[PDB]
Amino acid sequence: KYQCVKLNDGHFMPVLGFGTYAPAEVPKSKALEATKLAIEAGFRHIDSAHLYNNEEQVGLAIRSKIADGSVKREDIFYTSKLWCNSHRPELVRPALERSLKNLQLDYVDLYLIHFPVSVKPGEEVIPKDENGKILFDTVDLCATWEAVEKCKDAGLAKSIGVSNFNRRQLEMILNKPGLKYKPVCNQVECHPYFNQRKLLDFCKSKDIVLVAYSALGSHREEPWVDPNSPVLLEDPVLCALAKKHKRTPALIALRYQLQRGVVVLAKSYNEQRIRQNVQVFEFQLTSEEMKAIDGLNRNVRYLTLDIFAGPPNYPFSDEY
Ligand SMILES: NC(=O)c1ccc[n+]([C@@H]2O[C@H](COP(=O)([O-])OP(=O)(O)OC[C@H]3O[C@@H](n4cnc5c(N)ncnc54)[C@H](OP(=O)(O)O)[C@@H]3O)[C@@H](O)[C@H]2O)c1
Ligand SMILES: O=C(O)c1cc(Cl)cc(Cl)c1O
Ligand SMILES: [Zn+2]
């Protein structure tokens, strides 16, 4: 179960991670219960973000499990993310400090730039003008990264990384004059329909971990995900693999990522499925079965985040 990977800064990340995001209609209380369940089941990597509006609950869950002696703080790998309304250098540490206040934790294990397109500062996560048009902002992401680096210097984040960055954007950070810390990871959509071979190879080449999200084919929340997209977990090949191994399509999709050198997230707010997901460590796939899963690639991106298209930093126009 507890398998970790060494990050490029010498910290360790558990290779299986609990996703904590739920669609807006899901009550906040559910994040609290699910996160406790997840830790009880064996999850030690917990993925959240300021965007998710659940850091009070996830923090409560984590601290409850530390209070009752189930885990120590050093046993939990907790990730947060800097939202698009706090890309300005001077807003970076206040954002992290606000997440920490909400969590009642003294540090996060990992802090990520959530998405490379900036939006106007303020309380609104998606600011719009009086006609409903998104209020984008102009911010040098290299200046953002420098402020994120200072959060590591401060001890407020053990490790730092990025999310939804393309190759060009990784290169921008990596090649920045006076770089202190490379991103330890790039957290991106990744699953058998969209298996990110080119980006995976690039991240590998730069000692950057690829962390897969929507690894089970995504929450499929409208208007974010096209309801007409094929359903990952209904895939005939994943189902046949599941039957052969006495596992589930979900477990096949998870194991796939582990065996290709990808750290993998899995969201569930269902006690049974939470408990089931940690079984990814209990079985293996052959090289032939891995090749079969490689053939499933369809160029299906579930989360285009195309409401943020237009600005130059929109990451998904490039090939990868
Ligand atoms: N950085 C970013 O921009 C970004 C974007 C998307 C996601 N993420 C992160 O990655 C996480 C996971 O991605 P996701 O939220 O799109 O969901 P996901 O992990 O791909 O899972 C999608 C759905 O699968 C169901 N599920 C879970 N285990 C299952 C199983 N064994 N069998 C059948 N169904 C199962 C869940 O429903 P139940 O809850 O009903 O089990 C969940 O709604 C997020 O929660 C978040 O932490 C980050
Ligand atoms: O989970 C996320 O990070 C996420 C981010 C964005 Cl911007 C939108 C949706 Cl629907 C998400 O699920
Ligand atoms: Zn007006």
Give an account of the 3D structure.
Belongs to the aldo/keto reductase family. With 320 residues, the protein is α/β, with parallel strands linked by helices. It has one domain (1-320): NADP-dependent oxidoreductase domain (TIM Barrel). The chain is built from 10 helices and 10 strands. Strands 3-4-5-6-7-8-9-10 form an 8-stranded parallel beta barrel, surrounded by 4 helices. Strands 1-2 form a two-stranded antiparallel sheet. A hairpin with a 5-residue loop joins strand 1 (4-6) and strand 2 (12-14). Helix 1 (29-41) runs parallel beside helix 2, helix 3 (89-103) packs across helix 4 (141-153) and helix 7 (236-244) packs across helix 8 (249-259). The chain is globular. The structure holds NADP nicotinamide-adenine-dinucleotide phosphate (NAP), 3,5-dichloro-2-hydroxybenzoic acid and zinc ion.
The number of E-state strands comes to 10
Number of helices: 10
| First-to-last CA distance | 32 Å
Largest sheet: 8 strands, parallel, barrel
Sum up the overall morphology in one term: globular
Bound molecules: NADP nicotinamide-adenine-dinucleotide phosphate, 3,5-dichloro-2-hydroxybenzoic acid, zinc ion
Please summarize what this structure is.
The protein has 10 helices and 10 strands.
Question: Which helices and strands, and how do they pair?
Answer:
Blueprint: E1 4-6, E2 12-14, E3 16-19, H1 29-41, E4 45-47, H2 55-67, E5 77-82, H3 89-103, E6 108-113, H4 141-153, E7 157-163, H5 167-174, E8 185-189, H6 197-205, E9 209-213, H7 236-244, H8 249-259, E10 263-267, H9 271-277, H10 287-294
Parallel strand pairs: 3-4, 3-10, 4-5, 5-6, 6-7, 7-8, 8-9, 9-10
Antiparallel strand pairs: 1-2
Helix pairs in contact: 1-2, 3-4, 7-8
This protein binds NADP nicotinamide-adenine-dinucleotide phosphate (NAP), 3,5-dichloro-2-hydroxybenzoic acid and zinc ion (ZN).
Main location: cytoplasm
Protein name: Aldo-keto reductase family 1 member C1
Organism: Homo sapiens
